[model samples]
Target: ETITVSTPIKQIFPDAAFAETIKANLKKKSVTDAVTQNELNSIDQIIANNSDIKSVQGIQYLPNVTKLFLNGNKLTDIKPLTNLKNLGWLFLDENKIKDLSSLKDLKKLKSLSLEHNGISDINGLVHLPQLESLYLGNNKITDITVLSRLTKLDTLSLEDNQISDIVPLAGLTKLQNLYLSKNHISDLRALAGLKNLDVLELFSQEC
Candidate 1:
């Protein structure tokens, strides 16, 4: 894959090391922009050109960035985000990201929006102990196994997925706002355990 970098990439830095850094930074910005504008289809070309990128877990260059948006980019992997340590808000909706391996390193992340992706696993989210709000509407996830560890999560959105079970809600005892509409759920018995639940949006109709 070849990430299409502008001519500035070559003209800005003479050292190979600094060039790589700049390359990563630009690619990150590109990706962030792609998500915000709903231009996820462009990410494939970007990653193809920028192969030197390491991790998307902790963005080291954007030090003051508190909110970052990267939605609908069809990102299959987030290993390059490991450098964004101070990231508080992350939006990654409508992408092809299936794994959470890179998210394990983002300990400072607060709010995450991952609606309408092809994600089925939540293994990488356990590291985000500080996660407060999560929007996960319209995906292909069936199992809620990963929500058991997110004790700090306050808002959870799980609409339009493949979930047939709600066993994961047992761990989200602190959840304040929950959205589980438009899924395969037929019963709400699992929600009885959410003693602290304030708002719950659920639909028992066709999934």
Candidate 2:
């Protein structure tokens, strides 16, 4: 006796645009082509910006993707990206994300961009110890106490926010390019310790 087996379409993506993105990147013929773990693992980067993606539910299969760009989308929940452990660079700008609890597990994220969104609380940032370049501009951020732990940052951007305190930012000694434009800051003496700050953008904001 002999036996043969086959697995029918196991993966599913609710968002049509998001499914097309995965299919296009994997070179699949059509939507009928079932997405397998083998194909998902083969991808190193996926730039699906301006693709009208609403949910990233099926992205967890791509565990090996290092660079991901989901910018200019309609995402509100990014919990799917937490499984991308190898992600080094991520751009989730121009989204409707307010909760950042999903970012706690991304330990390999060195460069992150969450600009042009609605983020007020950033306590989830303390878990990332390898961050280098961070952009948190154009948001509703007032508290930055979590930034003190990310001492490895070299380029930091916090422009167009409601922040008025610069005491927490003074500890980022390795910072070279710091942007604190368009805010109401009272103290400029807090950043006196940043001796490596070569290009500082304090456009009517911060010290």
Candidate 3:
């Protein structure tokens, strides 16, 4: 039911190597190896971390995948992932992604990481109420009012952003670890309600 990649196929090159590497990585990460261009009814998880994949259009066939990791790649468009209704954990960090509207339908997501991207507005993530851990650091986000709705969050990282206000996060009392370093925030009154905070980072001159 689950398979794991035991070796890294670095000797191969071109499309053949790419395909084999994907297949091997899919199988290695416990994802269904039977995935084809037309068939993907058994896959449940896929971890393609640092695989150098440029696009995710071909992964739409795995509708059953619950956790998908495509970080450390060159991906720009993730529109194909909209069809994954069961997606719970998605990590696309260190990529070229700019638009997150395509992931609005995945309400079941528990952990979503889009760090080091070009994301500005976080309105698209307002729909994911089940999120527990969210990492949006090193982006262009400013307004965080949209995150006020994600009260179930426990770990949130907004470091190295353009955020200047912390009022929107006052309601997230359940937050345990919050990272807001290198921002324009100069007030700590908004964080008074967060009693459960275990680690809070507000490094930089503005803090």
Candidate 4:
């Protein structure tokens, strides 16, 4: 017998064995016709069970997917989901991902949770036009000047990183919630221009 899965289970688990197990599970009493728009929309809270997975290479064909949980992996590339147009939320905590340029094409992306990744640069994030919230805590980011281009951003999280300067936020006029705890930020002058901000959080300072 042959079995197949329509969703990208490997993207979340990244383990081939685990992916096959998910496929097997989906094949049992699975109804493809029941996968409607409403059902798809409700599948946002998808999570992986493989604890040994180190990376998620290409899992992107879930059209109605809203949220993706891939915490504690070694994902280096997200190129498989180059065509996911409806992806809104992503969870990639405790990973080794370095490049995020592939995510630039996702226009509907609203929330991102990339905490505990090895990411340092904010190059790919500038193009996310619809992004509202971002979580990039506990990384190796050295420069946050690239975040100035994310104007539509409402919530920002950069806690537990190695950022020392934050003077480039003078152009973020749409920020509302900011989280920059447990970093090396020394100067708060960068937030002087973010007048549209509603909620801000920093260490040993008031905003």
Candidate 5:
């Protein structure tokens, strides 16, 4: 007698390196082959950091994943990360990523780290309303008006950027720890609404 399965059996990985990582995680005996959708759904968290992974194309299989660490890679395009809606803590620092439009769908995200990348446009961050701890240090960010939407933010880091105005961050009274070093900002009068600020770093070059 034979049994039948509902899930598909053909799950191909576009990136060879990513395929090897998934194969190792699943403990498959085969050298290289397709992975089952059921097998992909069973995964909860992935720790494939600094594995020389350049693409996240196969990450869409892990829909149930909450925590994903992919820092210190050569990733340039991370448009595929939008499929993981359940992600809570995502680390993509030290990559070559520049765009943030794909991150708008990750509404369940809380703690996010994108430092040391090529991100200059952060307008996509306005959609993440549930974000708590956000780290975007060592990037090319300048404007922070979108961050005003994330009122739930407690810890915010925008160090080593090109920002000069901090008027948008005035409404973030929930901020506890803030880092704005290495920018062009020189104003603190807008921070009067922040009564819960525990640590604030405004050390810049001009100011």
Candidate 6:
């Protein structure tokens, strides 16, 4: 029980497996003063994924952390998680991130995964506005017109980037699962206004 929390959750969890998983989940909720700051903002799901984590810088005071899984660690400055703001499902996949402008103020994000990092500017997702499942697979993205304001995206994964224009995905229209594999899309008439797409993946180029 070497739980000595504080200092903003020990400067973004300076490992010991995050102090033995916050002292065994605060001794199974019997909470023997888990070093206050309101018991570390009453922790809400913090899985220190692939535990070789490198500085999260105090997790911006927790503020009721809502699901933070730092996948495959060795993080490249997350800018202190942009003050949490009640985050909703965030997984920083395959770390070594390229600045996301500090996640553009969270905006109650909904399911976000930055797969295979070192991202090419997505214009920091234009203030999130409740994003719906986004995974930027194998980065180094080539202009996607900033995803046309997200449009409440429904599962969008840009598999293996360097995207060749798809006319900004033709106004999303609440897309339903679209993954463009190994880019260089010839064009599919920009997906014809989506029409509520149902799992569409353009495998290995050639439209």
**Best-matching candidate per lDDT:** 2
Q: Candidate 2's C-alpha lDDT? A: 0.84
lDDT tens readout by residue for model 1, 87-115: 67777775667677767767888898887
Top TM-score hit: 2
TM-score of candidate 3 relative to the true fold: 0.83
Ranking by lDDT: 2, 5, 3, 6, 4, 1
Taking the tens digit of each residue's C-alpha lDDT, what string does model 4 give over 7-47?
34444435664354344434523322222223333334456
* Greater-TM-score candidate between 1 and 6: 1
Candidate 3 on 107-145: residue-level lDDT in tens?
788999999988897898878887899999999888999
- Worst lDDT run of 10 residues, candidate 5, spans 1-10
Q: Would you list the C-alpha lDDT of every candidate in the order shown?
A: 0.63, 0.84, 0.77, 0.67, 0.82, 0.77
lDDT of 4 at 54: 52
Q: What would the TM-scores of all predictions be?
A: 0.68, 0.92, 0.83, 0.75, 0.89, 0.37
Give candidate 6's TM-score: 0.37
- Write model 2 residue lDDT over 60-114, tens digit each, in one string: 7677889999999999999888778899999999998877888888999999999
- Which stretches of candidate 4 lie above 4 Å from their native place? 1-14, 17-21, 24-45, 49-51, 55-58, 196-198, 204-207
- Stronger candidate by lDDT (1 vs 6): 6
Question: Which has the better TM-score: candidate 2, or candidate 3?
Answer: 2
Q: What is the lDDT of residue 78 in candidate 4?
A: 70
User: 38 in model 1: Cα distance from truth in Å?
Assistant: 30
Q: Name the candidate, 4 or 5, with the larger lDDT value.
A: 5
Better model by lDDT, 2 or 6?
2
**Regions of model 6 farther than 4 Å from truth:** 1-15, 20-37, 42-63, 66-71, 74-85, 95-108, 117-133, 139-151, 154-157, 161-171, 174-181, 191-207
What's the true lDDT of residue 99 in model 5? Answer: 78
